[PDB]
Amino acid sequence: GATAMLFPGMGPAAFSDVGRFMVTNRYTRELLAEADDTLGYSLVDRFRQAEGDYSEYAQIAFLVNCVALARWAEQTMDLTPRICAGASFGEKSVAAYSGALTFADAVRMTAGLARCMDEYFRTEHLGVVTHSFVRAPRERLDEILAELDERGEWHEISCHIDHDFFMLTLHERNSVWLEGRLRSVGAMPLYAMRPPMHAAAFGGLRDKAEEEVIAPLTFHDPTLPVVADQDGKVLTTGDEVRTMLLESFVRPLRWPDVISSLQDQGVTRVCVAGPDSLFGRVGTTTRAFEVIAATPRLAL
Ligand SMILES: [Ca+2]
Structure with missing residues (x-):
């Protein structure tokens, strides 16, 4: 091959x-x-x-x-x-x-x-950051996104890597929270990128x-x-x-x-x-x- x-x-x-x-x-x-x-x-x-x-x-x-x-x-x-x-x-x-x-x-x-x-990014989309994480099944991911939805928080899935591996882009006022939530369900935050x-x-x-x-x-x-x-x-x-x-x-x-x-x-x-x-x-x-x-x- x-x-x-x-x-x-x-x-x-x-x-x-x-x-x-x-x-x-x-x-x-x-x-x-x-x-x-x-x-x-x-x-x-x-x-x-x-x-x-x-x-x-x-x-x-x-x-x-x-x-x-x-x-x-x-x-x-x-x-x-x-x-x-x-x-x-x-x-x-x-x-x-x-x-x-x-x-x-x-x-x-x-x-x-x-x-x-x-x-x-210094004059537009102020505060936006991209998070990478693994061991986050998509259903667990979707639960987190639905919680962001309930609070009117903007987000986009920026990378689909594996079944349980993604990058999510959103406002930095949610970064620490997202990390915690991911750890809650056995996922692992990798890094936050700007x-x-x-x-x-x-x-x-x-x-x-x-x-x-x-x-x-x-x-x-x-x-x-x-x-x-x-x-x-x-x-x-x-x-x-x-x-x-x-x-x-x-x-x-x-x-x-x-x-x-x-x-x-x-x-x-x-x-x-x-x-x-x-x-x-x-x-x-x-x-x-x-x-x-x-x-x-x-x-x-
Ligand atoms: Ca809000």
């Missing part, structure tokens, strides 16, 4: 988890030089000093790391991937990986989208992103097909990859559709390229495929 290259969503991490990998690995070093030129700054140095978990600098560095690990894994393990897919942030990585964007343009886009989101992602309510952000960051870029046809993360559709053109990146703002990630599409495409093995402890480990993926988890730790 076929091998697919997969790019994870971006979780929070410390510079400390990857710094040594970044400056020592041959593949990261080449992409960093290209990144620094594009950006006009030393990414490693800015990332080291950065605030929070999702700075512009941490996002570009995650880009660098995932694409580096994909190349490293192909070469060192003689993978000849036939198809690829990215989840959430990983759409940006797969855009680079598939050559739908030059690596420089992918860095430009990633930086631009980071700044665009930062500016948007900027938030994937929500019908983010149409004005999609527009701004389109105008300021994405419209100016030249997309190229991918060198291999790309399975969209909104719905599992197989994509073969630059335009489709562009559309995917913009749809990402307003449609949820549906990882089960990505996995079942890949099964339908005759995939039996996947490599998950990047610092990840979610996408390479979740049952949705492992129940379907043999997984290679190409992490900084494996590469070292």
